[PDB]
Design a protein around this ligand. Structure first.
Ligand code: ATP
Ligand code: ATP
Ligand code: MG
Ligand code: MG
Lengths: 715, 17, 715, 17
């Protein structure tokens, strides 16, 4: 039956598109983001295990088969997912749809459906297959609708303005159509009857008509621009406000570029909606009016003008696609050249050391040759389109004049009628040209709209959790992990089953090495992720029930890689909390040892902060972050080592801060050196996903365990 | 469905994208 | 005398542009590239020490004075160069010209000339002054030239295509003139006298005339496109070929982006040097011909057309500048929005932890507001221009008809001549419109041409030296450094004049740590940078007077960081040397021990590297580089061992290989650890640019010097 | 000639953009 293949919206989603296409091949449509998150795509790529996982949960009875050299037997159920290494650069996934008569058909997500033979295809793909089959517990359902239906919801409140564009738009042409008739009047009332005074009057009349038309054009355009600005701003702002309320896995899956490009995508939809909702409503009416009027003027040459438009439309449609393919090829080759230029400039040290300037010059010349060949090939395509448009545009005018003259000789129409007709043909040709030219806009706009709406429909962070807020006013209690297990993604679970206990208001240290998720536990306690197995108990109550906002406002966390935002210290230090007095700020600065590098600043009141400023030092950034954490005044704080800038002297001030806080608060320090943890009440050592033992320095040393070996390694 | 079975380790090592 | 200000080409070029503006103020116009050289501008910015040193070198008596707050003393000569902290992020350099009635004039290279009052200027600028005076060594001269004259030399050999284009374009306009008279012929004879047999023949004749016109347009367009591609390719290849041969200081000074952008700038001037010259050659003459045709057709109506063109030119030249002023502001504000948005996506961990998403949402909204305000402000001026042009067009169109009707009724012309003139107005209006519209293209293209050509006029790296290669063709000999002091530019010297000797065919190691040199001395030996005081002596001859090509082809170099180029190992190994047999390559792979890595690869040597050897490990890359060094079979070898991935597994292999050279070739090793240098014959330690001691390991240990402490710290 | 004399190192600190 019908073949289906879903394109790429981003560049890392090769694996997800194949599964979506296979689902749609069996009547299952799902938003690409909702399958993307389920299969757990990472930044680097997609592991086949994730595909099998999402398949067996979705309903498909998948199997991971080591595809042999011979895969021609008619035994397994087609279609199936295959993995390839495209031109030996990076891995990629395609799907095999039909196998018969020494022909393979693959629905490449990159391109359309493409056909290969035995040898050329068999050379490229290195085994591997994923069998999919819609067995039991499968249902054909579609969770995705039309995104534009949602987006018109932004247009609806701004209704009154639209009609003001529409109401003016009629009164525009209603004058313009009159303005065309002047050429007829002159050749009827003035040339033959030499009515001088009437000529003077009609001149001023048509002049004031034209100035009225221009004024109305101005009034229309101002409203169009204002409406476009309003729609565009609303779309961007709604999207950006929604993005912030998602769990962290969304942000870890994608990069920063694929979140920013959504803003240009939204800007595209402004033009799409404005152009469509204006043209479809006004230009078709103008075309109808023009057609009726010219049918009144003359029937036959109306059919001439109709065939002119038909040929123009056919010419545009036949050339729409090859231009797009040529443009895509040019855009690929240009980047493939830019890569070589950048590499050569970077490695000119080696190039000059070995004296191989000709070797790079010839290769760059060959690649420039390819770029120029592609550019000229596409330029010839524009040349052909322009010539084929010009033939119609000119021959149509010539035959229009010829038919008009022939009808004049027969005695059916007058010369003034001919000239008015020829002048008014603009009002029936141009609107149709605009209607035809707008088809690519809708074609790209629907894809852009789907791409942006997939993110919007995705579940927000708040909605997932279940809340019980009024029962627990106070965070205070013992921290415990009960049989908690965790994995970042399809990756092997970094954190295993652990059992840990933390009493009230005690100093706790966490020591780990070689990246065993030492900071992972801090984020899990911050409830950025959810443990699928196990739970976190505070005051004998599981974290999942406590309100998320109170937690996030009453947990203190300092990033191992501190981040500061551009602006002024006064507001940047109190990020998150408004209505803050200077007294507690300065006391926090005193206790966090922050005031002593404020005098050297230009103005204490307004110290303008720059991103990646040369003045700023990482020690000062971490001190600022610690100041914010103490300003949050919680009972639960998490901190990481300075690792630089005289850690020994900062140790004294940190110990003054924690000891001088004078409350029964809980603090968790994560570090890789044992020097400061000697006085810690309780220390936890983490190795390869397991807490080896719980205790303090004295008995860990007496235990004759591995901690003894690390301590001797230190000294 | 008679092809040679593939272990999960290769599935993890199969980094497509 | 008028005030002239030089505009900045690059972002980090504020220091040199001001000096160039001063030079032109004193009538010494010289290329900005040669200023940027002697000023020693780096990627970060410009040191005032460089400005003063350069000014003294030219002849300007320069005095650096801290500008006092009170600056109303007319005791020093003007103008003067001073810094301004326009924003906390970026310092800047500007020129103050004169003070009149407590109003200062400042030529900002970024934005033309701006005037300030005492209240707002003193606030922005920080105390700085550089008094520049012609000290009887200055001379009024001119070194700069007309660059487009040079670039036309590429167009001159393409005489055939240009002449064919000119002839075809002339025939195009001639056919247009012939075909325009259809209305006059129709309304004079054909309609009045009713000659159907004549009507059909005339219609067919004008149809074939128009078809020939379109074919000529197609033929002209193909040649124009081909000529444009040819000139573009020639310019880009010549530019790249010249750039590849410069001393490294140019590449250390600038970024890679500032070298790449010139490629786009080349296609920026292809369109000027083709279209502008074609329009000047063709449309001016064609407009002249149309002028005589209309003049003999009618005089007063020609005067009407002239006033229409005059009004059009006035409006365009009035609105040319403010639209650019709005466009540049929009670009700046859009970039400011994008940077502050990327800063928001990156710091997700903080923004979600502190519960401050409202704070960032409000700021982003107030910034998008500014973006839309700027865009709307530009839109108003654009629509003003659009409506004002339409008013002129329409009023001219109606007035032409009015005047023609007056003329025909009074009995000066006939009916047909009026419509013939309306048809023929295209060939006199469109060329002149193209002439007026072309001005901004030339205005920006001249700056682009200067920016591209200032690089080209610079002297390449080959001819700086003077060599006597015929006398000595052999690298072999003793290396000597005597009183050699080299500096990167105008910063603190990295080396100081030293006495060093390297014997023939002997094993020498150079150890450098704690930020000391270990590569600067190597590149100095490589003749990358010209030593300023002292010389480097080989076999009783200074290296400076030997063919540079042989020296670089007889010294093998391994950098601290390695670079691998996109391709295959087979061609990557023999980079810069063809006519190479596989036998010696396999031998080198024996001594380089790269063979252990080739078996597991799918192809032995035809294996394509994905992207600069991304799949490889750095230790493997270093081994591959070693092989490249060995393939040269150079007299002198320079190695830098891997930091930590040697693992004492390839270290023994490297020792075996260097022992198995089995020839008296000079060997240099640089490392940051003393483990293996025990076998080395002589070892030299460079401390803060000083060779304090020189000798072998045993004597240095016996000396109980700093090397002894370093050895004990190592072991 | 009016103003405070600047040392060479302070001139070296004088940086532009
Ligand atoms: N995007 C990611 N960011 C961080 N860790 C990741 C990511 N994706 C997977 N991981 C894995 O999560 C585990 C824990 O990462 P975590 O950030 O806790 O490191 P860590 O224990 O603090 O290590 P280090 O001290 O070396 O930074 C690691 O095994 C790491 O490979
Ligand atoms: N053209 C240049 N070449 C080398 N160093 C430069 C140059 N311009 C500025 N520098 C600076 O000079 C300093 C010393 O450079 P040097 O060549 O001695 O490096 P190094 O101490 O050997 O370092 P590494 O071992 O990492 O190569 C560095 O701080 C570097 O940034
Ligand atoms: Mg970490
Ligand atoms: Mg070095």
């Amino acid at each position: 039956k019908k073949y289906v293949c879903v394109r790429q919206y981003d560049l890392t989603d090769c694996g997800a598109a194949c599964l979506s296409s296979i689902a749609q091949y069996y009547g299952l449509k799902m938003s690409l983001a909702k399958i993307r998150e389920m299969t757990g795509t990472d930044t680097q790529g997609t592991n086949a295990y994730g595909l099998i996982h999402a398949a067996k949960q979705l309903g498909f009875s998948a199997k991971g088969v080591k595809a042999s050299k011979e895969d021609l037997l008619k035994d397994f159920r087609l279609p199936a997912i295959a993995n390839v290494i495209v031109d030996n650069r990076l891995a990629h996934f395609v799907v095999i749809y039909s196998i018969k008569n020494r022909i393979i058909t693959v629905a490449d997500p990159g391109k359309g459906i493409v056909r290969y033979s035995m040898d050329d295809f068999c050379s490229i793909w290195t085994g591997g297959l994923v069998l999919l089959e819609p067995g039991e517990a499968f249902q054909k359902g579609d969770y995705t609708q039309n995104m534009m239906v949602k987006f018109a919801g932004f247009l609806k409140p701004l209704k009154k303005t639209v009609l003001c564009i529409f109401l003016a738009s009629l009164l525009y042409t209603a004058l313009g159509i009159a303005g065309s008739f002047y050429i007829k009047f002159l050749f009827d009332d003035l040339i033959k009857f030499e009515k001088l005074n009437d000529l003077h009057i009609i001149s001023a009349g048509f002049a004031v008509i034209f100035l009225l038309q221009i004024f109305l054009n101005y009034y229309r355009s101002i409203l169009v621009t204002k409406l476009g600005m309003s729609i565009d701003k609303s779309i961007m702002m709604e999207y950006y406000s929604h993005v912030l309320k998602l769990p962290m896995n969304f942000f870890n899956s994608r990069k920063v570029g694929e979140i920013i490009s959504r803003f240009m995508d939204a800007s595209k939809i402004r033009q799409a909606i404005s152009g469509a909702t204006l043209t479809i409503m006004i230009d078709t009416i103008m075309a109808v009016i023009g057609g009726i009027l010219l049918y009144i003027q003359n029937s036959s040459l109306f059919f001439i003008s109709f065939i002119i438009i038909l040929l123009y439309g056919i010419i545009v449609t036949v050339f729409n696609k090859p231009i797009q393919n040529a443009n895509r090829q040019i855009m690929e080759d240009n980047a493939k050249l830019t890569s070589a230029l950048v590499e050569s400039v970077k490695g000119i040290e080696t190039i000059k050391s070995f004296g191989a300037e000709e070797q790079t010059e010839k290769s760059t010349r060959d690649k420039i040759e390819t770029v120029m060949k592609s550019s000229f090939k596409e330029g010839m395509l524009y040349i052909n389109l322009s010539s084929l448009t010009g033939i119609v545009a000119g021959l149509g005018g010539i035959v229009i004049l010829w038919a008009g003259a022939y009808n004049v000789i027969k005695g059916n129409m007058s010369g003034g009628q001919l000239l008015a007709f020829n002048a008014l043909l603009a009002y029936f040709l141009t609107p149709v040209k605009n209607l035809i030219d707008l088809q690519p806009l809708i074609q790209t706009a629907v894809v852009a709209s789907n791409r942006l709406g997939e993110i919007l429909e995705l579940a927000t962070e708040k909605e997932l959790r279940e809340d019980s807020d009024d029962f627990v006013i106070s965070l205070k209690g013992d921290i415990e992990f009960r049989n908690v297990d965790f994995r970042y993604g399809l990756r092997k679970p970094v954190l295993k089953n652990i059992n840990l206990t933390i009493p009230k208001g005690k100093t706790v240290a966490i020591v780990g090495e070689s990246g065993s998720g030492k900071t992972t536990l801090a984020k899990l306690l911050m409830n950025f992720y959810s443990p699928e197995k196990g739970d976190i108990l505070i005051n004998g109550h599981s974290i999942k029930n406590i309100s998320l906002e109170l937690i996030r406002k009453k947990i203190a966390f300092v990033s191992q890689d501190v981040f500061i935002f551009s602006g002024t210290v006064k507001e940047n230090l109190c990020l998150g909390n408004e209505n803050v007095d200077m007294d507690e700020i300065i006391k926090a600065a005193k206790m966090a040892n922050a005031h002593d590098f404020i005098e050297k600043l230009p103005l204490k009141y307004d110290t303008f902060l720059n991103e990646s400023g040369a003045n700023l030092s990482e020690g000062q950034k971490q001190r600022l972050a610690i100041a914010r954490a103490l300003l949050k005044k919680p009972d639960i704080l998490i901190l990481d080592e300075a690792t630089s800038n005289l850690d020994s002297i900062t140790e004294n001030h940190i110990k003054d801060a924690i000891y001088g806080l004078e409350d029964d608060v809980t603090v968790i320090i994560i570090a890789h050196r044992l020097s400061t943890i000697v006085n810690c009440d309780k220390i936890y050592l983490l190795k390869d996903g397991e807490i080896v033992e719980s205790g303090s320095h004295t008995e860990l040393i007496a235990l004759k365990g591995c901690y003894f070996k690390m301590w001797k390694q230190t000294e | 469905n008679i092809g040679r079975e593939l272990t999960d380790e290769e599935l993890m090592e199969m980094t497509g994208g």
